[PDB]
Amino acid sequence: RKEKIIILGSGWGGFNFLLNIDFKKYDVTLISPRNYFTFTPLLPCLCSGTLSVNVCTESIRNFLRKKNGYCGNYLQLECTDVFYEDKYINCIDIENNKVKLFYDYLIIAVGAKTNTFNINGVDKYAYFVKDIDDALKIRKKFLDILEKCTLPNISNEEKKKMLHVAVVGGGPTGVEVTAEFADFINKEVKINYKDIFNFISISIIEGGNNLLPTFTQNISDFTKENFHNLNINVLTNYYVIDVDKHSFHIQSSLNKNEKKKLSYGLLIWASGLAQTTLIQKFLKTIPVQANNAILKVDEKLRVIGIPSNNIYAIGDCKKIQPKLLHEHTNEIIKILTGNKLTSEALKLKQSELTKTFPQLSISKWDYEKNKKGEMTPQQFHDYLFEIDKNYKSPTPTAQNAKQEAYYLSNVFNNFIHTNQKFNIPSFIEKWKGSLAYIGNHQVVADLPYYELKGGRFSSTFWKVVYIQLLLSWKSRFHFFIDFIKTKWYGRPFIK
Amino acid sequence: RKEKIIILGSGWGGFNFLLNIDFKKYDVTLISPRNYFTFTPLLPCLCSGTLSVNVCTESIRNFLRKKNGYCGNYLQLECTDVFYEDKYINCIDIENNKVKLFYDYLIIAVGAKTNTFNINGVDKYAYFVKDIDDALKIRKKFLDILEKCTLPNISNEEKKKMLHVAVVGGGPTGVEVTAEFADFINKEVKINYKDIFNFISISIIEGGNNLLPTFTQNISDFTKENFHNLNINVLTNYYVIDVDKHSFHIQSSLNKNEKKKLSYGLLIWASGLAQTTLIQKFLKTIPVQANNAILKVDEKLRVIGIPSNNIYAIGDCKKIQPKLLHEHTNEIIKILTGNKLTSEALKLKQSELTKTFPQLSISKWDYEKNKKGEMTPQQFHDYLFEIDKNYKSPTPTAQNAKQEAYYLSNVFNNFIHTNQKFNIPSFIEKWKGSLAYIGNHQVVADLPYYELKGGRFSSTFWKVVYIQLLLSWKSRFHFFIDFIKTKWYGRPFIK
Numbered sequence: 001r002k003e004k005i006i007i008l009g010s011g012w013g014g015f016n017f018l019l020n021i022d023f024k025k026y027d028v029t030l031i032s033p034r035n036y037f038t039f040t041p042l043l044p045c046l047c048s049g050t051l052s053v054n055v056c057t058e059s060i061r062n063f064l065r066k067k068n069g070y071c072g073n074y075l076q077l078e079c080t081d082v083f084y085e086d087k088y089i090n091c092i093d094i095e096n097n098k099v100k101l102f103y104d105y106l107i108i109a110v111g112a113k114t115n116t117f118n119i120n121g122v123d124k125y126a127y128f129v130k131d132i133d134d135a136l137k138i139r140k141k142f143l144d145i146l147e148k149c150t151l152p153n154i155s156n157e158e159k160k161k162m163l164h165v166a167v168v169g170g171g172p173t174g175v176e177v178t179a180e181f182a183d184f185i186n187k188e189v190k191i192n193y194k195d196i197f198n199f200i201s202i203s204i205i206e207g208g209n210n211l212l213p214t215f216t217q218n219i220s221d222f223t224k225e226n227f228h229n230l231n232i233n234v235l236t237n238y239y240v241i242d243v244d245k246h247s248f249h250i251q252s253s254l255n256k257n258e259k260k261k262l263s264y265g266l267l268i269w270a271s272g273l274a275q276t277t278l279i280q281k282f283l284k285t286i287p288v289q290a291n292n293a294i295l296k297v298d299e300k301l302r303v304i305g306i307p308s309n310n311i312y313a314i315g316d317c318k319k320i321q322p323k324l325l326h327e328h329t330n331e332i333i334k335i336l337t338g339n340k341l342t343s344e345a346l347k348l349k350q351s352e353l354t355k356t357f358p359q360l361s362i363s364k365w366d367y368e369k370n371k372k373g374e375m376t377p378q379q380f381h382d383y384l385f386e387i388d389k390n391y392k393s394p395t396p397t398a399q400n401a402k403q404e405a406y407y408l409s410n411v412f413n414n415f416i417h418t419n420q421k422f423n424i425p426s427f428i429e430k431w432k433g434s435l436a437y438i439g440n441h442q443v444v445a446d447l448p449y450y451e452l453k454g455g456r457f458s459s460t461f462w463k464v465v466y467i468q469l470l471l472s473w474k475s476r477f478h479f480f481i482d483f484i485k486t487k488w489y490g491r492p493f494i495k
Numbered sequence: 496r497k498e499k500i501i502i503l504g505s506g507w508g509g510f511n512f513l514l515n516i517d518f519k520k521y522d523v524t525l526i527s528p529r530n531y532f533t534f535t536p537l538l539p540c541l542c543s544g545t546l547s548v549n550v551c552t553e554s555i556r557n558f559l560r561k562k563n564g565y566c567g568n569y570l571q572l573e574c575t576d577v578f579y580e581d582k583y584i585n586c587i588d589i590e591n592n593k594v595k596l597f598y599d600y601l602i603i604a605v606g607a608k609t610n611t612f613n614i615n616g617v618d619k620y621a622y623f624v625k626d627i628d629d630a631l632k633i634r635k636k637f638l639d640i641l642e643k644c645t646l647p648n649i650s651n652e653e654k655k656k657m658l659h660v661a662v663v664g665g666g667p668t669g670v671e672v673t674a675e676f677a678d679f680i681n682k683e684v685k686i687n688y689k690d691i692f693n694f695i696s697i698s699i700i701e702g703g704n705n706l707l708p709t710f711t712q713n714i715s716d717f718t719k720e721n722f723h724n725l726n727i728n729v730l731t732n733y734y735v736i737d738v739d740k741h742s743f744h745i746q747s748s749l750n751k752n753e754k755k756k757l758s759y760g761l762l763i764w765a766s767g768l769a770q771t772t773l774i775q776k777f778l779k780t781i782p783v784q785a786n787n788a789i790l791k792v793d794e795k796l797r798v799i800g801i802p803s804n805n806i807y808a809i810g811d812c813k814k815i816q817p818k819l820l821h822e823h824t825n826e827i828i829k830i831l832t833g834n835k836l837t838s839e840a841l842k843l844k845q846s847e848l849t850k851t852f853p854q855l856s857i858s859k860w861d862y863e864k865n866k867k868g869e870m871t872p873q874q875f876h877d878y879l880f881e882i883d884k885n886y887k888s889p890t891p892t893a894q895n896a897k898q899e900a901y902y903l904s905n906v907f908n909n910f911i912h913t914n915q916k917f918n919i920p921s922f923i924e925k926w927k928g929s930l931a932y933i934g935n936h937q938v939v940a941d942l943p944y945y946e947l948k949g950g951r952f953s954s955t956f957w958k959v960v961y962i963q964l965l966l967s968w969k970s971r972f973h974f975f976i977d978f979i980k981t982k983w984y985g986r987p988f989i990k
């Protein structure tokens with residue numbers, strides 16, 4: 001008769017919730033068609049064979065038995081419908097047999113799927129980079145092309161066309177996949193395929209002017225230079241408008257009349273998120289959310305429009321729509337009485353108010369740049385409203401999905417059925433910074449309070465960071481060993 | 496204008512020939528649809544996840560550059576026809592494009608394929624254990640069945656049916672696959688799937704009375720005992736006669752009228768060799784061999800019936816048909832130094848005559864059990880004829896394919912086109928013994944002067960043997976690391 005929590009998804013959100021949720025307090029079942037967790041940041045390393053699958057994964061069932069002797073459950077199912085009124089979900093197994101499951105709480109962490117932007121042919125011809133199997137197919141395809149072009153029945157012209165690798169997307173994933181292929185090409189491939197090495201090329205295609213546009217401008221500039229120095233074709237200010245079997249078309253972002261047709265052998269699609277069909281269907285079921293393009297939750301991560309307040313959502317499948325400051329003006333005015341109505345008066349209570357309004361965090365609202373003198377009540381209401389409008393939901397990252405998971409699981413463990421049940425603070429993420437590998441041993445990092453821009457100890461920093469981020473000693477062992485293997489014996493060619 | 500050697504196959508014969516052939520003296524191309532070598536003895540460990548793919552393989556292209564600076568070639572092709580009159584072969588690539596290649600010498604090492612004994616349904620429903628992809632599919636299937644049987648939509652009766660693993664073949668492969676599954680089931684599976692552990696069973700089906708029939712009787716009995724002790728169903732004296740989607744039928748070897756119908760979830764086919772289509776086609780093309788079921792070579796491993804004597808064959812695809820003693824009686828009589836034609840007179844010159852007649856080897860003919868007094872020329876002829884008829888071709892093992900490869904490559908390196916042209920000795924294999932893993936840390940070995948029958952140090956012996964048998968430091972490193980990983984973290988469940 002323990003309350004039942006159903007987790008949907010075995011990704012950064014679902015798995016980390018599982019890792020922290022108290023199996024003694026709750027009956028927990030994780031449901032996912034994928035019986036492992038994927039350490040997504042290392043996926044580009046899998047495309048080149050730098051790292052192995054064991055570094056990049058965790059088996060869900062290895063974490064179902066916690067040390068206090070209490071256990072969770074896992075079911076290999078795809079959820080297809082949620083029925084919030086009757087508190088159950090419909091799932092299917094791999095053979096499309098329906099199965100019905102009841103819950104007391106539902107944690108939706110189903111992530112997102114790849115976005116083709118309805119561009120003709122990318123679903124058909126492009127390789128996505130979202131999961132382990134994608135990375136493995138990409139590696140395999142590249143190796144198949146190398147062998148094909150070593151055959152006598154192929155002209156040099158066809159070789160140059162087949163050995164062009166195009167990567168679409170200038171964010172960290174497109175950049176790292178491109179960098180890993182450049183390393184592989186310049187090292188193991190150059191040694192083992194010397195007679196076709198000169199025919200190989202790589203292009204990276206990006207709509208904006210910058211590679212790694214969310215990093216600093218120095219890092220973007222340094223990434224483009226390092227790519228130039230590696231003889232990678234940087235097609236910034238271009239985006240894809242059509243894909244066919246042996247060529248694709250790109251469109252200049254700077255001149256709508258300029259188009260280019262490019263031949264290619266391998267096309268890697270490393271950009272864009274779209275909603276899962278489950279979320280699209282769930283949305284239509286919620287009156288308040290029926291025309292939404294994304295699932296909205298509370299500042300406490302409760303799905304909005306559910307009378308029972310028993311469905312949560314974390315990670316990439318959702319956006320936070322916090323309680324509105326400006327619907328609570330008089331109350332906020334009340335909590336700071338002595339002080340005149342100034343922005344500084346507001347900031348003075350930021351610590352307390354932030355527990356219920358995340359948009360008041362100094363990480364969310366710049367009080368220096370938006371300093372405001374004494375205001376009338378009505379003026380203060382408008383200011384509050386501007387803070388509401390300025391609120392940005394957590395970015396769709398592993399970092400945020402992990403932090404949301406720890407927050408929410410800790411709420412179930414230590415708040416929900418305790419004397420602290422009315423003191424649940426709102427979720428506020430903390431930015432810890434980002435790393436990207438950009439080729440030829442160069443690592444960049446955009447962190448709070450510093451930037452890293454390549455250099456001899458760049459890769460050492462990367463390794464120190466990621467070995468601590470891995471979620472088991474097993475993966476850490478493999479992480480360490482894989483770099484020894486790669487240094488001593490090189491990347492493998494088994495396909 | 497170096498002479499061109501084409502090697503067909505990247506297995507034990509082809510790869511080991513490549514490893515020893517002098518690239519300076521010859522222009523060598525290896526042709527195989529498989530761009531790696533498979534260390535087949537460790538394949539059963541791959542079915543359970545004890546060892547990884549990197550321990551079990553070698554990429555061909557990593558061995559194409561020898562230290563002296565000279566190089567070989569590899570082409571990823573399947574040979575389809577040999578034209579021995581015009582000295583070329585036809586090949587196809589994976590897209591069915593034909594390619595024609597000329598040679599001065601052709602080394603046929605294409606191995607064998609699995610034999611279904613034309614039993615209905617085994618090609619449709621059974622899993623073979625012949626190569627890397629086979630072992631991986633078997634592992635995946637087993638993991639899939641476990642997850643399926645954890646779902647709430649399945650009766651206990653259906654579970655017992657689906658969790659029955661049947662292995663067909665009581666030789667070392669069937670036994671080792673069975674043993675590895677038993678270890679996996681008893682350790683990682685028992686821990687991670689407690690609620691269905693008791694529904695799992697394994698049967699091994701074998702026509703004869705003995706598991707490991709080619710080992711000693713003590714080892715065979717010990718293997719059956721160990722299997723009983725592990726609660727494996729030992730169905731010796733049974734063979735499979737039909738295979739359907741969810742059940743198969745077996746037939747008692749002891750009573751023609753007794754048949755059993757068995758339910759199963761995973762059926763593993765670990766018995767039988769058949770000829771490749773290439774070799775079947777090649778045969779019909781050679782007058783002298785047109786109605787043969789196997790390719791015959793002479794005592795120097797030259798294909799018989801080829802006017803140019805420039806096609807060789809090694810490994811599983813061939814049988815040796817040595818030059819006949821009894822067609823050379825008079826010459827043999829003259830070589831003998833004796834007052835009389837005795838068996839002992841023959842054995843006295845055995846070390847010299849064995850250079851041309853392998854069937855005279857003490858490993859091939861038992862001179863003590865067939866001792867013969869003074870004979871007449873005609874009687875000596877009949878005796879010689881008995882030795883001829885007693886000759887057994889090298890058994891189809893990696894050990895023999897490897898020794899044949901080193902023999903033949905050494906003949907090309909040091910005998911062909913030198914003043915030893917006419918001093919080429921016949922091939923005679925050396926038996927080194929065999930090892931088998933039979934479960935729960937028990938290793939058996941049947942060696943020239945010892946038998947090993949389990950015990951605490953038997954696994955230790957197994958490891959020091961195989962780490963020396965591996966063909967690169969890369970694989971040895973992985974061999975060592977995989978055992979540490981499996982001991983510390985267990986076998987993985989990633990599928």
Ligand SMILES: Cc1cc2nc3c(=O)[nH]c(=O)nc-3n(C[C@H](O)[C@H](O)[C@H](O)COP(=O)(O)OP(=O)(O)OC[C@H]3O[C@@H](n4cnc5c(N)ncnc54)[C@H](O)[C@@H]3O)c2cc1C
Nearest residue numbers: 009010011012013040041079110111315316396397398399
């Ligand atoms: C190549 C790559 C590199 C990345 N690198 C970084 C990085 O360096 N730093 C960073 O912060 N972020 C990184 N990310 C982003 C990060 O992976 C995502 O933000 C994170 O995966 C979000 O976690 P999630 O739990 O919401 O979704 P996911 O981790 O994608 O998990 C979704 C889970 O739900 C399951 N699922 C899907 N549909 C259903 C269904 N209908 N029913 C049940 N289960 C379902 C899926 O099988 C999956 O297990 C990277 C992403 C990629 C693709």
Ligand SMILES: Cc1cc2nc3c(=O)[nH]c(=O)nc-3n(C[C@H](O)[C@H](O)[C@H](O)COP(=O)(O)OP(=O)(O)OC[C@H]3O[C@@H](n4cnc5c(N)ncnc54)[C@H](O)[C@@H]3O)c2cc1C
Nearest residue numbers: 504505506507508535536574605606810811891892893894
């Ligand atoms: C599971 C298992 C365990 C084993 N354990 C042992 C053991 O412990 N000890 C032992 O001595 N033996 C063992 N063996 C036997 C050993 O693997 C074989 O005897 C050995 O493989 C024979 O070598 P080969 O070169 O003739 O054939 P293979 O090693 O099979 O190589 C044949 C090669 O030819 C290629 N080929 C096939 N058709 C064509 C074509 N038409 N054109 C070009 N190439 C082609 C194949 O891709 C392959 O690369 C084991 C076998 C298996 C399956």
Ligand SMILES: [Mg+2]
Nearest residue numbers: 009011014109
């Ligand atoms: Mg998740």
Ligand SMILES: [Mg+2]
Nearest residue numbers: 011012037038
């Ligand atoms: Mg994931």
Ligand SMILES: [Mg+2]
Nearest residue numbers: 111112113316
């Ligand atoms: Mg996602």
Ligand SMILES: [Mg+2]
Nearest residue numbers: 111315316317
């Ligand atoms: Mg999500």
Ligand SMILES: [Mg+2]
Nearest residue numbers: 504506509604
């Ligand atoms: Mg071979």
Ligand SMILES: [Mg+2]
Nearest residue numbers: 506507532533
């Ligand atoms: Mg092989």
Ligand SMILES: [Mg+2]
Nearest residue numbers: 606607608811
């Ligand atoms: Mg074979």
Ligand SMILES: [Mg+2]
Nearest residue numbers: 606810811812
């Ligand atoms: Mg052969």
